[PDB]
Symmetry: D2
Subunit: 179 residues, 4 copies
């Protein structure tokens, strides 16, 4: 039951968002999630973040693993949010120019972890080292793949992909979309 | 055409295999593709490799990009095959203990590229930097996702996934399975 | 909400089963869902039926529409369940010898509807004619397709397909599989 | 190898179209296929029809089975085309008003077969009766489902779904799309 650690709200309409942590459209949608929840109310929607790792974002596997490591800390899903926020705020610094070059060609995973730790104020290296943690990475990927998710972000409402929803929408459109 | 770079044989039965370059089971299946073609016959089958980048294999994105970078050199698919072979032979050195730890925590994308260059004897860095190369990476991923590939390896015969086929199989079983 | 008409129990582990109403294996699994809920516990699981219409079951579209028509009557899911039970009990009479022949070659959609009405003791024709009902049929099909369901039945636990689970399984195996 | 019976051309770009025989958009695309082939040339494209049976088209299973029965006759893929053309020309007559009512509520499969036979000039009942024929129906469905096909028509080029292509396009757009 990894299907559960990145949920907010408890209401019967289910909004699922597939996010790539270093993707600029993903980040835009990410930063609108608070408002969505605040508008719709926790008694009416459950909002779930699903991690969509993109192979052409070469540190995604590391970054994704951090987010999920953070989720095992005491802050749980909030520590995970902290990490996503730290990365989202400093997006370019966790990606590669044209998905090919730039300073990160010379950054190590341990660098990327340290850098997340700085920005988030969280201690990740020990949690990251936990071997059970691969199963959370696998769950997200397997779930994304079963649902045919490619583009980040992708929005599902009650289990159906909603091609018309965009990270550019006003929160108020998401609110009527969710219905 | 991204859809047929990594392609061998010219027969009418299409055999597609999804491989993660640093996955032990993938490597096992990879080293059987020569026999497969020999035993099935180039007049009967076409064998194509698709790259299944697994996010829990943290250097997969770098490595997959290298493979597709090699396919752009003069030797095409043979140079890509050279790169897959070099990674496959030294699989452990391009992965992480329990997909979490070990020396690769302290390696950089550039370390990994240099390493594949050594072992394959190919010059890749320049080709790796070509910004058009993200599209090849996207094509494999997109095709994999549309077909719902998750487990590596997975085998397709004429566009249908074959959940019974396995990397442990004797090649002679693949030959009858293909038909 | 199409996504939860055919739903029982209120537990947090979600058990989804894709059923073709005239499929022998589906029928077998269908008649085990009462035990499943009893043994797993309504406090632990939610069981949902999704309708997997198989095109080689030639009256499936008529029959699936009837089921979803029943769900619109006052008895809701219980009336839909009544219709599934009536079809299930007389499965052979709503199918075709070798999916090709037999008496149903000479039956009409109206014959099939009357037949289900007899056996379930429900009045369906009027509800069947409601033009809004195509959307329920579309919803199941769309959801099935997005998840890549093909074989009937197929089982999902918390949104992941479970290829190991089977209609032959003892219900006690389902209970441990669910967890 | 059912993957093969509805192909025209032999060129290296592969245009796959998923069609529902009684779907009006499907029919529109269907009638443009000749021109597409004539423009692009049989040495440059292979054009493949994939049958997308829609459960809310209540005689689709029957009609689809006919098409595939026709493919086993001596005319092979042309006899199959004849059937698709006979149905396409008389579309409404093989469907239901609002996918719910109309005269067809009182039509039997044997009626639908006879009606196809009239319009196509072909003898189908014996071919239809063949039990092997279920495997062709299964192949199309399984292939559609693995690829996540819902909407009819859906267009793939070299194995990727092309969301931007429409049955409303000019043939000349398809030609540059296929590239």
């Amino acid at each position: 039951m990894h299907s559960d650690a990145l949920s907010w709200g408890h209401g019967p309409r289910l909004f699922e968002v597939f996010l790539e942590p270093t993707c600029p459209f993903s980040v835009k949608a990410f930063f609108k999630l608070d408002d969505l929840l605040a508008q719709a109310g926790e008694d009416n929607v459950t909002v779930r973040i699903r991690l969509q790792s993109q192979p052409w974002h070469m540190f995604s596997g590391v970054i994704v693993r951090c987010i999920l490591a953070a989720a095992t800390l005491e802050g749980g899903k909030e520590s995970a949010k902290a990490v996503m926020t730290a990365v989202a705020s400093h997006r370019e610094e966790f990606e590669f120019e044209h998905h090919a070059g730039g300073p990160n060609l010379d950054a190590t995973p341990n660098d990327i972890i340290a850098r997340i730790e700085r920005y988030s104020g969280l201690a990740l290296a020990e949690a990251f080292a936990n071997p059970e943690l691969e199963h959370a990475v696998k769950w997200h990927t397997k779930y994304a793949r079963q649902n045919g998710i490619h583009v980040s972000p992708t929005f599902m409402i009650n289990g159906l992909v909603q091609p018309g929803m965009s990270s550019g929408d006003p929160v108020s459109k998401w609110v009527s979309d969710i219905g």
